[PDB]
């Protein structure tokens, strides 16, 4: 009967189900992980100069 956590990947939406203390703290957790990438990603592309890809 206590607050639970979810998400949608069609709208990329966080879903909470519970308390207003859960609204208060999971709007914080929305913001904590809503961070973008900083230049350097998971995937890179190397331009090889003397080597053939």
């Amino acid at each position: 009967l206590a607050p639970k956590v979810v998400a949608d990947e069609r709208t990329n939406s966080v879903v909470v189900s519970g308390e207003p203390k859960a609204r208060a703290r999971i709007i914080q957790m929305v913001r904590q992980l809503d961070r973008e990438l900083q230049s350097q990603g998971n995937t890179r592309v190397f331009y090889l100069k003397y080597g053939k890809a």
Binding site: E9, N12, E36, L37, G41, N42, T43, R44, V45, Y47
Partner: protein, 52 residues
């Protein structure tokens, strides 16, 4: 893909779609040929004595 992968694929694409540079390649094939044959030879034939 997920928005996190969308942003990752968006950098991959931008790097991968870089205007590929063009190369003008001139080859130069030069050949030079010649040579000298020489055939000089002398034959002496005599009814009385003999021939070569």
């Amino acid at each position: 893909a997920q928005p996190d992968v969308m942003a990752e694929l968006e950098q991959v694409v931008a790097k991968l779609d870089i205007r590929r540079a063009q190369v003008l390649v001139e080859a130069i094939i030069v050949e030079i040929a010649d040579g000298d044959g020489l055939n000089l030879g002398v034959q002496w034939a005599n009814t009385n004595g003999g021939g070569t």
